[PDB]
Amino acid sequence: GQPTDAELAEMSREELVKLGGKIDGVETIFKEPRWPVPGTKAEKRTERLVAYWLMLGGLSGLALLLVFLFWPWEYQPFGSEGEFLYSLATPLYGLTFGLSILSIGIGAVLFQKKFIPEEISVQDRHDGRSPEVHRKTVAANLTDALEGSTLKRRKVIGLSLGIGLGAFGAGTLVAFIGGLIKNPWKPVVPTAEGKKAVLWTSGWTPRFKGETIYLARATGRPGESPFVKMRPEDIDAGGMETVFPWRESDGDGTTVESEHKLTEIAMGVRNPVMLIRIKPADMHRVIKRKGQESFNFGELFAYTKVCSHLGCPSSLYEQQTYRILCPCHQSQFDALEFAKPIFGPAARALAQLPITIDEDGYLVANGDFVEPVGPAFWERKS
């Protein structure tokens, strides 16, 4: 029960380790070497085994360096000599790296399990409820700090500090978050009926009364003339085409003024629509919505692609069933009837675009959606 002022000099390594364990509350029981018997060749075999694992790790690390610096990396076009090498380039990087570090780890584990001595050290756990001396001394220190400070005695300071901190926190939090806060209902998008909020308006909202908005088909041409006017004859019974609200002013993408209007048309969340041609035989099964009975142009029905539930496109059109399925959450809308959901999370029908043909026979929108078209939100259905 003494700190060993001078006995440490002659205390051996084992005695010093035991002393450290004792001081820390740790008693090492059965710390025994793995190879008490000397000169055996099983020891040499295990030595060679861990050495082989570490050397495999090193060889694989060298392989990683050699393949990384010297290998046919770099994308190779389809069906070109060197495509196979490129394809298995990254796999080789990963294989070499992972094998190297994994083999090093295996060697380290084997060294721990075969050479580092085995111990069952048991540590005294002093968890919970620090001794009463420490508890009461901490409590006394904190209480003396609080009471000596003379707080809870200067009522004016107690209340004034609270008011000041609360007001400063209020001001700071409000100034931090007001930059982010924006009004969703600020009228910004221009429209024939004056500026309106974004959610109400899509690319199909007439900017000026009587504007012509063609159901332009989006050819995949990279950049130039991405949207081209469309005609009813182009679609045939049981066919679907994704159309966009193209204006004569939004000409081809050749100019710089254009190719931004066209990019806006393409990136409009509520812009894309699906034009579906209902078969003449199945035209008798169509059930129409209130205020949407005349929306269809003969056997052409234009429904927003944006799913009424969370707004994913509902592109999966199934003919001979007339079901517009959404891939995001597997909701079917019955196209024959007004595009009402007959399965899945959706509960509101897809907005139906009024369509017709202008002069020259090109398909144009005969108005705007009679309801907001994207996914629903609080300020809706009124």
Binding site: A108, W185, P375, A376
Partner: protein
């Protein structure tokens, strides 16, 4: 003279500072050597790899929606309008040496991070490591899991892709607009406008590389510090009590094996990044509101939220001139899930009455109701995940898509009940098996009695044997019991020579009796310590 250099450096360190006592405490700290206690280390190591790969990724990633035509090397996407985020992700994939590998190992590390967090949560929940001393640790770990989920969401949303973009559009935008009083305002604050607002990906990039990783790093520091100082709990065992830690010291064994385990986890993740393709964005065109795909799934850690979206039955309410879409249902569901997960230890202690300082873990069999509840929750989570995957499940395994959706809908209230009942009874039957072993000994081969033709299994008692054949039953002590003479002192001495050739008999005998002496010395040391604690 490396020894002299080490001695001089130690003396200089102990003169400038005085870390001798503290460092000795750290080195002598004892950690239990149970395998299940490495599950948290898996998550920690995956997190470290995530940091290291994320720094490399940020050195090459440009977050922006600024439209650009690719004009890169990847021929199948040339002249196509794309965000600079997608363009730089493609540049990492193709136009940086090893960038594809780095991003793939980063994504695989993210998946392993989520998976190992889930496995660690299961370990602690089923073993009762959240009780009185460590409910705060459980709480901060739950916050950590939530942060990991959402950071993975933002991470695979960072490179503006068709899949990730449609996932964002669904989850973030739709469910945010759905929220009744402040949904649209939250949407506009987060996106700075309508959904495709031109600040979304820069904001997510900041949140994902600086903000959320910073919070996760701070919470992991708190977690590891708490585990370090509230000494790690342990399973009941020979010398293990509520007031001691039986295991190995930090320095010689635990440090070496933890470092080696980190090396091997890094190796597994690198091998996956090499051999397995993760998120091949090049196949996925740049995000466009019109383009879609059939799959449209999130990473597995958000697959349960997506499955909740899919399965919940399209219940919408329409108050006076307003709408309450189906997204708010899932929002509230997620809120409830997180609240219950965070508040379970307090719920557990309110229900049961346990306010005792618990330092010995409980076997999941020994705690049936909690084991049953955990099994029920895991069954619900798996059902939700496979419901999110129902599209691909229906496609490959030929099941109607409607059939899978309704299987999920019915099973999210049926399968949890079935799994609860089965798990409760399974735990009680594991207890019954343990007591059978305690009262009869281990089972072995059958023998036919000499005088008559009775058959007796020839058990092996685990404790003192009565004057007659039958043994004195032992008392259950919360520790696993050996149900196979396999794992006891029976049939365990193969020729110790080599795989192909033997060794000299003298060497074999020396080694085998040395091992026998060492193992009986360990057993005797544990037995003596156990007797000393109370006796």
């Amino acid at each position: 003279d490396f020894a002299k250099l080490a001695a001089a450096q130690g003396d200089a360190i102990d003169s400038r500072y005085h870390p001798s006592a503290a460092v000795r405490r750290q080195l002598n700290k004892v950690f239990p050597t149970h395998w299940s206690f490495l599950l948290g280390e898996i998550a920690l190591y995956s997190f470290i790899i995530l940091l290291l790969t994320g720094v490399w990724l940020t050195l090459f990633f440009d977050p922006s929606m600024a439209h650009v035509t690719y004009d890169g090397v990847y021929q199948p996407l040339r002249g196509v309008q794309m965000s600079r985020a997608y363009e730089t992700a493609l540049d990492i994939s193709f136009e940086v040496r090893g960038g594809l590998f780095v991003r793939q190992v980063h994504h695989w590390a993210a998946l392993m991070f989520a998976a190992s967090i889930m496995v660690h949560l299961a370990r602690i929940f089923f073993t009762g490591a959240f009780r009185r001393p460590r409910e705060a640790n459980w709480v901060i770990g739950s916050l950590l899991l939530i942060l990991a989920m959402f950071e993975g969401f933002f991470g695979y949303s960072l490179p503006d892709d068709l899949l990730s973009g449609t996932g964002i559009r669904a989850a973030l935008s739709g469910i945010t607009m759905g929220i009744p009083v402040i949904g649209t305002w939250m949407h506009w604050a987060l996106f700075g406008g309508d959904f495709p607002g031109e600040i979304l990906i820069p904001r997510l990039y900041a949140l994902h590389i600086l903000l959320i990783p910073g919070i996760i790093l701070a919470l992991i520091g708190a977690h590891l510090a708490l585990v370090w100082f509230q000494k790690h709990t342990q399973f009941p065992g020979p010398g293990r009590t509520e007031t001691n830690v039986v295991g190995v010291r930090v320095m010689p064994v635990f440090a070496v094996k933890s470092g080696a385990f980190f090396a091997m986890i890094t190796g597994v993740l690198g091998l996956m990044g090499g051999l397995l393709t993760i998120n091949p964005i090049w196949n996925l065109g740049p995000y466009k509101p019109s383009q879609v795909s059939a799959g449209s799934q999130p990473d597995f850690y958000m697959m349960w939220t997506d499955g909740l979206i899919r399965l919940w039955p399209a219940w919408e309410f329409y108050p006076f001139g307003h709408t309450i879409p189906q997204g708010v249902w899932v929002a509230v569901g997620m809120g409830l899930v997180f609240a219950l997960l965070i508040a379970y230890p307090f719920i557990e202690k309110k229900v049961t009455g346990d306010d005792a300082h618990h330092n010995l873990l409980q076997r999941p069999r020994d705690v049936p109701v909690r084991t049953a509840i955990g099994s029920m929750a895991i069954a619900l989570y798996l059902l939700l995940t496979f419901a999110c995957m129902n599209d691909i499940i229906a496609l490959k395994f030929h099941i109607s898509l409607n059939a899978t959706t309704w299987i999920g809908r019915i099973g999210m209230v049926v399968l949890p009940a079935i799994v609860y009942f089965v798990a409760y009874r399974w735990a009680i039957s594991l207890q019954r098996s343990d007591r059978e072993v305690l009262e009869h000994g281990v089972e072995t081969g059958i023998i036919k009695r000499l005088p008559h033709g009775a058959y007796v299994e020839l058990h092996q008692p685990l404790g003192p044997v009565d004057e007659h054949g039958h043994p004195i039953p032992l008392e259950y002590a919360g520790a696993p019991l050996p149900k196979r003479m396999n794992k006891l002192g029976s049939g365990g001495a193969p020729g110790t020579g080599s795989f192909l050739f033997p060794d000299p008999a003298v060497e074999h005998e020396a080694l085998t009796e040395a091992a026998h002496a060492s193992e009986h010395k360990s057993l005797t040391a544990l037995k003596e310590h156990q007797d000393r604690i109370h006796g």
